[PDB]
Design a protein around this ligand. Structure first.
Ligand SMILES: CC(C)c1ncc(Cl)c(C(N)=O)n1
Length: 119
């Protein structure tokens, strides 16, 4: 029932994601010189360094907010992909499955702790 435990849990999950080779295209903001039309398709860029920095700045109130930004990394990859078989998009699908498998207990524990706090 620790209402604050999600933060270290998210730091550790981001550390695992940075170790994953599948995260390399998503570790820093997309390079507009490499993809000059990126902002014509993607309204809200997002990347894992921005997520980590937002967390470390104390600018996430809950793991749901972090999870919304990580899911935006994956939906941006899906929106920008020219093909469902592209290399970078395939890396995002595997990384998304890994992320969803690990974030589920973080979200459940947080929501349970908050419900206990408000009982
Ligand atoms: C990470 C950004 C640059 C991105 N998102 C999705 C795809 Cl699938 C691609 C690509 N180059 O094929 N690039």
């Amino acid at each position: 029932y620790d209402i604050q435990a999600w933060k270290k849990q998210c730091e550790e999950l981001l550390n695992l994601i940075f170790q994953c080779e599948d995260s390399e295209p998503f570790r820093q903001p997309v390079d507009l010189l490499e993809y000059p039309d990126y902002r014509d398709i993607i309204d809200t860029p997002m990347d894992f360094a921005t997520v980590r920095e937002t967390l470390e700045a104390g600018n996430y109130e809950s793991p749901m907010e972090l999870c919304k930004d990580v899911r935006l990394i994956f939906s941006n990859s899906k929106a920008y992909t020219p093909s469902k078989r592209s290399r970078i998009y395939s890396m995002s699908l595997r990384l998304s499955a890994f992320f969803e498998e690990h974030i589920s207990s973080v979200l459940s524990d947080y929501k349970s702790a908050l419900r206990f706090h408000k009982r």
